[PDB]
């Protein structure tokens, strides 16, 4: 039960999906929706 | 039952910059710009697409106050287009994209103030 | 097979090269009569390897467009405006029948809708005006009403007269000597004997009338109108 | 001069070589292609001995096949693909009518019921697209819906629109002011004055529309090429260089439609 | 029907043929 | 009173003139679109790329412009017309979008068709009639002016009558059907090369007498 | 960018290819006497870095077509200046190779744009669903965008390759990292165009009329040059080395 | 909006020397309720177009017989 709990709330939360996913979608995509915007003006 | 086309008919009151009232006819479920397209007061070749990325305020229409509380507001870039492709970098609070406004059955008798057509060639 | 199509394409290539050489020679001489808008229609249009076969005793109208693998029997008439198209499969037209004005026959071009069914027409079938037989087999000695909309898979057997404006549903056989009409084809009554004789009588009269046209529609071109058109 | 003679000789040589190569290419095909030949389709032919007496003001499209004794009045028009087959009995088409596109008019062989009458059409009568008239006796100023299937023995009165896609059955009389449609008789409704105005205006509109099609379909080769070149030249305008050159370009009268057909 | 009867196209045609001859010679003679 | 005239021609030698320009209006047919020799294009029709118009069609837009979309076919014996105005009050021009199958003997007139809108045989689409996308219209269907067909849904019968609702598996077969018809039209397209050799026969027949 | 927008498209096709070649020839001829090394190399180094950064971060937000081309040209000018900042024989060789490749690719892109000018293409979304109406033009334009991206199996990657090699020749490691970052960023918004015309299918379609034989032939020649360049690149390398070596002797 | 311009179009009506502020409502006919003359009506219309930039064209100036119609027309105007 602990293994099944921590295979969803540890590995899938604070290791790959959610924690380091700040480098994939919604992690850097929105970062370039502000930096690139305030450069034409 | 018979599914007449006349059920989803939306009539508006588009006014040219010359101060002339026009009785335009549109459809419920399509964009307001499409409704303005049949009359021809807005050049169809300028805004052929319905995508937001393909909008440069060439579909901009001025709306009276009494019609602005019964349609969804500008979310993130509906205001950006107004505050980017304009002579004055400021919102009017009375203008809205005709490309993003969808016509509903209850939105009949709406008055829209189409401004002077801006250049769009190149 | 595949090899024949390659030679057909090479034939197109060489034919167009020769045609372009002809156009260059004509244009070099100071003549531009190749730019006319002459109607490039053939009453016996074909594809690579179909070449519609027509019996010599049959009559086909100039406005008719026989396309594909259409086979025409003895004594049958192919009237003005009919669009008999038989590219995918055979379209057998019986002996002594007739296909009236502004009619047509499909073969159900698209192969998506199951299997394509070849069209079969029986002998002495008085196909009506504006018939839109959509690739259905029709047995001999029967009448098809004007404005009928026969669809694929329909087996109209012998003496199965079909009322005008019928829309018989696909894969629905018409019983012998029984009339079906309306939207859709519903039973109305049973075929009577005077109409049974009238079907063959009409077939014979239409065949004779077609023979008369073919006698008079094969008249020489009457160059008077040819001079009239040029002189304007 | 002599250079022109030499060039003409070279043109003949090139034409002969091109025709020979075309022949060779045709032979390589296996003779599986039907040759184009010439347009044998003829309008206004003689069925047995009787010719169609068509008026001068009538527009008959070149694709139409008007055969048999056909009497067509002034101002009317026959459109493309239409077939006025009148082999057996006369087809007295009135003046000011319009037998529209892909319409068929045929007459029974005097024995469909024993008391067959020739087909007659009145004046100011519209027939519609792809209609089928087989022995009807339309009278003046009547509307026929497109795709109608009027069988034998039917008589439609004045101002008695038949709905489009109808299947008017045998010996069915339509009273004036009634609109009948569907596979059975199936009366729908009465007439309206808006609708009578629409019928009259459509009838006159097709009369004042048919003449442009009549003129365009009857242009000589030396004239159609000139019009094609003129249309190509004036396809698009350029006010910039026109104003800079001090000139103005006006479209030729032969490329302008009469104002009666414009909306 | 023996002469082209166009005192403007013939010079263009002879110019074209002499251009072709010049091209084939330039390929060959060089 | 009816009188004959010698200006009449009982044999139009030239043919039919498939493309009929009306003043400045010209039928804008695009390349790679099959148009059969029997088809008559008059007025201001525009045929787009990948389309196909089959023999017998009498496409004419002398009243209002008529358009045929990409990879959309108009089958044989289909008469399409346009009107100045429609009862609905919308522009009366008829427009056919992409992947639309018209079906033989479909008498379109001032209608409006959305994409993926298979139309059955004997269809009498009238002025102001509208057809929403992903819908199929069964053969023999007739609908009066000002009548619409909703989104993907099957109709038919003598009037505009509901039949059933389309399933997901069958509603994606429309584009494939249009593509297959386009393939067959292209198969016909390669049959005849440009600039037909009739003019040679013109000269041969003219050489028989005079000039 | 405003000049590129407002100017007629045939003008800006000529305004971004021919003038740059002549001005860069002028700069190369001036460099033979500007032997200071402390007044010309560092200024061009800084300007190259700034140009790459600003082009990469400014063409991302552009929704029009010609504005995107202008900013891509600015970024390519920055990459071009990288090779001049080295100030060696290999640096000048990379400079000339990049100029040649960029000129060919710009001719390709503007041939596409003038081809689509027939129906007044303005925004990036107009060319949506082009993979079905005109698949061959779609794949050609995709190859052009990938050539801009420096994707390996195409021309436009060889130029950036040998440019970076020259940059590492002088030991300017800061230039290499900025070049890598800007290359990735530019590749993203290059492939954004491919997304808009192969994957996303909008409800409304725009049909483009065919082009003339001039644009078609130029387009075919340039597209075959771009793809099949990394199989036989020796003549360009040899001629560019001879050109760079002839600058001084 | 209508409420903002009503407070200003009511003020101009007080200068006609015939209109009493004790007999004026948002629903008040000029000819019937106020008893104004047709010429008095056109003077009221004239005072309305001087309030702002719009000219109140001739065609639409004959459908403001009631004050509420005039207020609605003024509020629903671009100028
Ligand atoms: C078994 C067979 C095997 C197969 C046999 C194979 C044989 C190989 C033969 C190849 C022939 C080569 C031909 C080269 C073709 C070149 C292109 C054709 C040029 C051409 O339009 O014609 C002349 C022009 O003239 C020249 O301005 C310049 C054109 C000058 C070039 C003409 C040179 C032709 C001489 C060819 C040698 C003669 C040898 C004769 C051979 C036959 C001997 C028996 C007609 O002008 P034009 O104003 O009335 O009209 C043109 C024309 O319509 C289009 O170009 C445009 O639409 C229009 O704007 C206008 O330009
Ligand atoms: C590196 C590997 C990949 C490269 C592979 C190269 C392969 C070798 C080259 C193949 C060439 C094939 C050409 C076949 C012959 C076609 C002849 C057609 C000529 C022609 O039709 O004349 C005009 C067309 O213009 C023209 O066709 C001529 C103008 C063409 C412009 C080309 C400009 C070349 C100079 C600049 C090149 C770029 C250099 C960049 C470094 C009129 O046309 P029309 O008769 O159809 O009627 C008008 C339609 N509008
Ligand atoms: C050996 C055949 C030469 C035949 C020469 C010839 O026909 O030129 C016409 C073609 C195109 O010219 P048009 O568009 O006017 O065709 C008008 C119309 N299609 C016609 O045929 O007249 O020229 C070329 O592309 C070839 C360029 C390379 C030529 C080597
Ligand atoms: Fe917009
Ligand atoms: Zn008959």
């Amino acid at each position: 039960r602990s293994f099944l709990r921590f295979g969803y709330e540890v590995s899938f939360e604070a290791l790959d999906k959610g924690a380091i996913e700040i480098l994939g979608p919604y992690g850097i995509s929105y970062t370039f929706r502000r930096l690139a915007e305030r450069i034409s003006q | 039952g018979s599914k007449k086309v006349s059920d989803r008919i939306v009539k508006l009151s588009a006014i040219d910059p010359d101060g002339y009232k026009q009785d335009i006819i549109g459809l419920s479920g399509q964009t307001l710009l499409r409704a303005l397209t049949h009359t021809g007061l807005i050049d169809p070749a300028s805004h052929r697409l319905d995508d937001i990325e393909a909008c440069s305020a060439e579909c901009e229409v001025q709306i009276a106050e009494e019609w602005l509380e019964k349609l969804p507001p500008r979310t993130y870039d509906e205001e950006y287009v107004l505050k980017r492709s304009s002579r004055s970098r400021i919102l009017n609070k009375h203008s809205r994209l005709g490309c993003q406004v969808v016509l509903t059955q209850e939105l009949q008798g709406m008055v829209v103030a189409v401004p002077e057509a801006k250049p769009w060639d190149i | 097979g595949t090899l024949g199509r390659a030679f057909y394409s090479v034939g197109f290539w060489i034919r167009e090269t020769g045609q372009a050489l002809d156009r260059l020679g004509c244009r070099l001489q100071g003549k531009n009569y190749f730019r006319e808008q002459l109607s490039r229609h053939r009453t016996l249009m074909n594809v690579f390897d179909k070449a519609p076969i027509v019996d010599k005793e049959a009559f086909v109208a100039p406005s008719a467009s026989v396309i594909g693998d259409v086979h025409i029997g003895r004594g049958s008439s192919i009237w003005y405006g009919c669009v008999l198209r038989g590219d995918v499969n055979t379209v057998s037209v019986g002996s002594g029948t007739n296909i009236q004005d502004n009619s047509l026959v499909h073969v159900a071009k698209s192969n998506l809708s199951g299997k394509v069914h070849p069209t079969i027409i029986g002998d002495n079938v008085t196909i009506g005006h504006s018939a839109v037989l959509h690739g259905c087999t029709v047995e001999d000695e029967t009448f098809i009403g004007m404005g009928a909309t026969l669809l694929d898979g329909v087996v109209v057997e012998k003496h199965g007269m079909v009322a005008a404006g019928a829309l018989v549903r696909q894969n629905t056989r018409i019983p012998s000597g029984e009339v079906w009409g309306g939207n859709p084809a519903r039973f109305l009554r049973k075929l009577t004997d005077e109409e049974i004789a009238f079907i063959s009588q009409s077939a014979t009269n239409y065949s004779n009338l077609a023979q008369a046209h073919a006698a008079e529609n094969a008249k020489p071109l009457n160059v008077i109108e040819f001079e009239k058109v040029l002189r304007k | 001069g002599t250079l022109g003679r030499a060039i003409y000789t070279v043109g003949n040589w090139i034409r002969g070589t091109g025709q020979a190569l075309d022949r060779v290419g045709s032979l390589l095909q296996g003779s599986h292609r039907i040759e184009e030949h010439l347009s044998r389709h003829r309008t206004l032919m003689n069925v047995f001995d009787k010719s169609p007496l068509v008026d001068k003001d009538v527009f008959v499209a070149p694709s139409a096949s008007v055969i048999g004794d056909v009497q067509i009045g002034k101002g009317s028009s026959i459109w493309y693909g239409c077939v006025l087959r009148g082999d057996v009995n006369n087809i007295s088409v009135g003046s000011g009518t319009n037998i529209q596109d892909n319409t068929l008019v045929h007459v029974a062989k005097t024995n469909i019921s024993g008391k067959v009458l020739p087909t007659l059409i009145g004046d100011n009568v519209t027939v519609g697209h792809s209609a089928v008239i087989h022995g009807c006796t339309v009278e003046d100023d009547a509307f026929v819906g497109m795709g109608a299937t009027l069988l034998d023995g039917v008589v439609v009165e004045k101002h008695a629109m038949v709905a489009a896609g109808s299947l008017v059955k045998q010996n069915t009389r339509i009273p004036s002011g009634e609109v009948w449609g569907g596979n059975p008789a199936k009366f729908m409704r009465k007439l309206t004055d808006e609708e009578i105005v629409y019928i009259s205006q459509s009838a006159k509109n097709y009369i004042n529309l048919a003449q442009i099609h009549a003129s365009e379909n009857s242009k000589s080769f030396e004239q159609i090429e000139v019009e094609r070149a003129l249309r190509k030249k004036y396809a698009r305008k350029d006010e910039d260089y026109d104003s800079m050159l001090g000139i103005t370009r006006e479209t030729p009268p032969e490329l302008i439609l009469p104002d009666n057909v414009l909306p | 029907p023996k002469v082209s009867e166009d005192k403007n196209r013939n010079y263009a045609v002879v110019a074209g043929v002499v251009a072709i001859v010049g091209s084939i010679g330039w390929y060959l003679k060089a | 009173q009816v009188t004959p005239s010698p200006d009449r021609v009982k044999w139009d030698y030239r043919g039919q003139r498939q493309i009929i320009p009306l003043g400045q209006w010209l039928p804008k047919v695009a390349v790679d679109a099959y148009v059969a020799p029997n088809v008559v294009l008059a007025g201001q029709v525009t045929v787009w790329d990948g389309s196909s118009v089959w023999n017998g069609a009498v496409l004419r837009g002398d009243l209002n412009k008529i358009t045929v979309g990409f990879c959309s076919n108009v089958q044989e014996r289909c008469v399409v017309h346009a009107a100045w105005s429609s009862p609905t009050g919308l522009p009366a021009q008829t427009l056919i979008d992409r992947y639309v199958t018209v079906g033989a003997y479909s008498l379109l007139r001032s209608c409006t068709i959305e994409p993926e809108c298979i139309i059955g045989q004997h269809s009498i689409l009238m002025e102001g009639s509208l057809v929403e996308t992903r819908s199929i219209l069964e053969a023999g269907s007739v609908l009066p002016p000002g009548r619409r067909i909703p989104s993907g849904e099957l109709w038919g019968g003598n009037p505009a009558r509901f039949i059933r609702t389309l399933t997901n598996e069958e509603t994606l077969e429309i584009p494939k059907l249009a593509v297959a018809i386009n393939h067959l039209s292209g198969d016909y397209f390669s049959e005849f090369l440009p600039y037909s050799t009739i003019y040679l026969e013109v000269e041969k027949f003219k050489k028989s007498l005079g000039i | 960018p405003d000049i590129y927008e407002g100017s007629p498209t045939p003008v800006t096709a000529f305004l971004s290819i021919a003038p740059k070649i002549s001005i860069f020839a002028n700069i190369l001829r001036v460099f033979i006497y500007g032997s200071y090394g402390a007044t010309l190399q560092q200024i061009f180094f800084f300007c190259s870095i700034a140009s790459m950064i600003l082009g990469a971060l400014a063409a991302m937000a552009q929704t029009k077509v010609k504005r995107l081309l202008a900013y891509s040209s600015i970024g390519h000018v920055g990459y071009i200046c990288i090779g001049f900042s080295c100030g060696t024989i290999e640096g000048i060789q990379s400079l000339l190779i990049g100029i040649f490749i960029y000129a060919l690719m710009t001719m390709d892109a503007f041939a596409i744009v003038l081809a689509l000018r027939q129906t007044r293409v303005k925004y990036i979304a107009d060319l949506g669903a082009l993979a079905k109406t005109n698949p061959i033009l779609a794949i050609t334009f995709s190859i052009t965008m990938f050539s801009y991206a420096g994707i390996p199996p195409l021309a436009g990657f060889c130029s950036k390759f040998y440019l970076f090699f020259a940059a590492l020749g002088c030991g300017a490691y800061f230039l290499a990292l900025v070049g890598v970052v800007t290359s990735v960023i530019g590749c993203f918004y290059y492939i954004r165009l491919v997304k808009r015309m192969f994957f996303d299918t909008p409800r409304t379609w725009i049909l483009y009329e065919p082009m003339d034989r001039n644009k078609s032939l130029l387009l075919a020649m340039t597209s075959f040059f771009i793809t099949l360049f990394l199989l036989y690149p020796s003549p360009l390398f040899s001629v560019t080395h001879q050109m760079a070596l002839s600058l001084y002797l | 909006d209508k409420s903002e311009v009503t407070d200003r179009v009511l003020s101009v009506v007080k200068n006609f020397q015939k209109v009493d502020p004790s007999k004026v409502t948002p629903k008040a006919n000029f000819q019937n309720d106020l008893g104004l003359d047709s010429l008095d009506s056109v003077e009221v219309v004239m005072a309305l177009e001087e309030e702002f930039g719009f000219e109140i064209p001739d065609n639409e100036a004959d459908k403001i017989q009631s004050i509420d119609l005039a207020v609605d027309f003024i509020a629903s105007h671009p100028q």
Side-chain angles (χ1 to χ4, degrees), chain B residues 33 47 49-52 54-60 81 97-100, chain G residues 123:
Chain B
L33 196 64
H47 205 296
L49 262 181
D50 284 331
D51 293 29
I52 175 62
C55 288
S56 159
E58 65 183 1
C59 74
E60 161 190 346
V81 167
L97 273 80
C99 182
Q100 310 289 262
Chain G
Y123 311 103

Side-chain angles (χ1 to χ4, degrees), chain D:
Chain D
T2 176
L3 185 58
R5 201 166 335 268
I7 276 176
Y8 203 95
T9 292
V10 175
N12 290 318
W13 288 25
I14 279 182
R15 181 196 294 273
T17 310
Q19 266 148 32
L21 184 63
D22 185 15
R23 195 185 60 245
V24 164
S26 173
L27 311 193
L28 194 44
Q29 270 174 201
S31 176
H32 292 318
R33 177 151 195 287
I34 313 297
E35 289 65 21
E36 284 256 20
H37 297 309
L38 198 44
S39 198
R40 307 294 298 270
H41 163 57
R42 46 183 63 80
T43 66
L44 314 187
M45 93 165 287
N46 303 285
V47 286
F48 286 92
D49 53 359
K50 55 187 73 66
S51 66
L53 197 152
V54 189
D55 204 43
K56 205 175 65 160
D57 206 7
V58 176
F59 159 62
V60 167
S63 83
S65 75
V66 176
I67 69 172
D69 47 346
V70 186
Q71 195 166 358
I72 301 169
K74 184 138 159 55
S76 54
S77 77
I78 311 301
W79 294 98
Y80 315 93
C82 183
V83 176
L84 276 296
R85 195 210 289 204
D87 178 81
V88 188
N89 301 111
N90 193 86
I91 306 192
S92 179
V93 169
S95 68
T97 59
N98 45 358
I99 316 299
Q100 276 191 53
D101 303 305
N102 269 340
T103 307
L104 163 64
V105 179
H106 195 207
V107 176
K109 309 171 179 180
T110 74
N111 56 6
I112 208 70
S113 74
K115 268 85 182 173
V116 187
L117 297 191
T119 299
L120 194 145
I121 296 90
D123 291 331
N124 297 72
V125 170
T126 185
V127 164
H129 300 292
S130 174
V132 169
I133 296 89
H134 212 267
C136 182
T137 312
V138 183
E139 77 193 62
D140 62 358
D141 197 356
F143 202 115
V144 174
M146 65 182 179
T149 311
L150 303 100
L151 265 295
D152 46 351
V154 300
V155 168
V156 59
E157 279 160 49
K158 48 192 57 51
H159 295 89
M161 201 155 58
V162 184
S166 310
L167 189 62
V168 183
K169 307 206 163 257
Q170 284 68 30
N171 319 294
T172 297
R173 148 162 288 116
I174 298 160
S176 70
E178 275 78 10
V179 181
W180 284 24
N183 284 340
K186 196 262 291 178
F187 170 75
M188 283 74 74
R189 79 219 176 79
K190 266 64 63 180
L191 187 65
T192 81
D193 60 357
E194 294 85 4
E195 207 281 329
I196 192 170
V197 176
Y198 170 92
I199 289 187
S200 175
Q201 73 74 60
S202 170
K204 66 183 73 175
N205 189 359
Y206 283 50
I207 317 304
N208 69 10
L209 184 60
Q211 70 276 17
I212 60 176
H213 278 274
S215 76
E216 187 74 39
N217 289 272
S218 51
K219 279 173 167 19
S220 53
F221 164 77
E222 51 263 7
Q223 203 303 329
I224 187 59
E225 291 315 345
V226 165
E227 281 216 320
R228 162 208 300 289
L230 261 61
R231 205 173 299 114
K232 175 91 51 186
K233 184 148 60 95
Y234 294 120
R236 209 156 290 100
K237 53 211 161 303
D238 178 27
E239 183 178 1
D240 300 332
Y241 212 69
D242 276 16
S243 67
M244 164 184 169
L245 288 197
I247 76 165
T248 186
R249 311 217 190 236
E250 272 155 50
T251 63
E254 47 267 59
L255 295 186
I256 287 287
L257 282 76
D259 274 357
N260 48 10
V261 304
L262 298 183

Side-chain angles (χ1 to χ4, degrees), chain G residues 9-81:
Chain G
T9 309
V11 189
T12 188
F14 187 70
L15 189 146
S16 73
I17 308 191
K20 282 189 218 300
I21 299 156
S22 55
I23 296 284
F24 274 119
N26 290 318
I27 296 179
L28 262 54
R29 202 169 285 273
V30 163
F31 182 76
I32 79 168
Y33 83 84
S35 79
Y36 266 64
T39 78
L40 212 63
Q41 293 179 357
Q42 303 104 30
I43 190 167
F44 284 178
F45 161 92
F46 150 77
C47 278
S48 177
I49 281 181
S51 45
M52 281 169 308
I53 290 165
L54 188 153
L57 311 173
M60 281 215 67
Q62 279 329 311
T63 174
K64 300 214 215 304
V65 160
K66 294 170 75 175
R67 285 263 275 171
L68 188 153
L69 266 294
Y71 278 113
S72 166
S73 75
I74 286 183
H76 269 64
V77 169
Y79 281 101
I80 280 293
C81 293

